């Protein structure tokens, strides 16, 4: 996260860290949607152009973290993956369309002060909140700069949703309905963005109707970090809810 700030303790208790077993490295962000399911970006696991194709056994999921590098004794929980599911129509060849993936944990994790699931949006919640100008929140342990450092602790930044036309005019990539962009305009004199290591993380919003936190997006792609005239693109969680239900019902929950 570029231009963010240190998160408070327990501020994003659904935040998950995707961790490479060996070498030991932070792969990506992710989110806890129930006691046994993690939500992330498909590109975190599979990306042929870079020779990226992770498997269940390659990774570890770390939950309830604050500190990026420390092993948080008696606080954090580490889990093993039982199965990975990528959207059947994820488009890695062209534009990262449907950049979404589910991970079923080997065993259910127990909730605590630092570990708690986020809600998935309903049609009406999506309808009400997903509007240009409304702000959402991104979190993660990714880089602080496009070409610096690395944070010590989880970072946080709040960003506004942008109008589809502005989104489209900012890039040469073909934008789908399964995506949305967010960030400040160069004009706005307020910055911030996701960056390397933040991929897969949550873009969340708080309902003013019921006071709950909803995940509306997944950190997907962007051209550089915090560039003027550029925005961040996120996977549109709601548009894909059906696929999520399906998978969860047909295989566990």
């Amino acid at each position: 996260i570029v231009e963010g700030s240190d998160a408070e303790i327990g501020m994003s208790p659904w935040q998950v860290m995707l961790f490479r077993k060996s070498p030991q490295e932070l792969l990506c962000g992710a989110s806890l949607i129930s006691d046994r399911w993690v939500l992330t970006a498909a590109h975190c696991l599979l990306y042929p152009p870079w020779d990226k194709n992770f498997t269940e056994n390659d990774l570890l999921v770390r939950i309830g973290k604050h500190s990026r590098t420390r092993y948080e004794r008696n606080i954090e929980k580490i889990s093993m993956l039982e199965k990975i599911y990528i959207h059947p129509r994820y488009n890695w060849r062209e534009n990262l369309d449907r950049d979404i993936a589910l991970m079923k944990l080997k065993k259910p994790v127990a909730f605590s002060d630092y570990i708690h699931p986020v809600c998935l949006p309903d049609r009406e919640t999506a309808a009400s909140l997903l509007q240009a100008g409304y702000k959402g929140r991104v979190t993660g342990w990714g880089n602080l700069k496009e070409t610096w450092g690395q944070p010590s602790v989880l970072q946080v930044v709040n960003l506004p949703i942008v109008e589809r036309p502005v989104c489209k005019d900012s890039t040469r990539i073909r934008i789908t309905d399964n995506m949305f962009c967010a960030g400040y305009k160069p004009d706005e004199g307020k910055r911030g963005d996701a960056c390397e290591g933040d991929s897969g993380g949550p873009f969340v919003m708080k309902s003013p109707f019921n006071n709950r936190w909803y995940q509306m997006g997944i950190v997907s792609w962007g051209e550089g970090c915090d560039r003027d005239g550029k925005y961040g693109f996120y996977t549109h969680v709601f548009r894909l809810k059906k696929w999520i239900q399906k998978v969860i019902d047909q295989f566990g929950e």
Partner: peptide, 10 residues
């Protein structure tokens, strides 16, 4: 840069 995690996990 990562601190060693517990072996039970690897």
């Amino acid at each position: 840069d990562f601190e060693e995690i517990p072996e039970e996990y690897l």
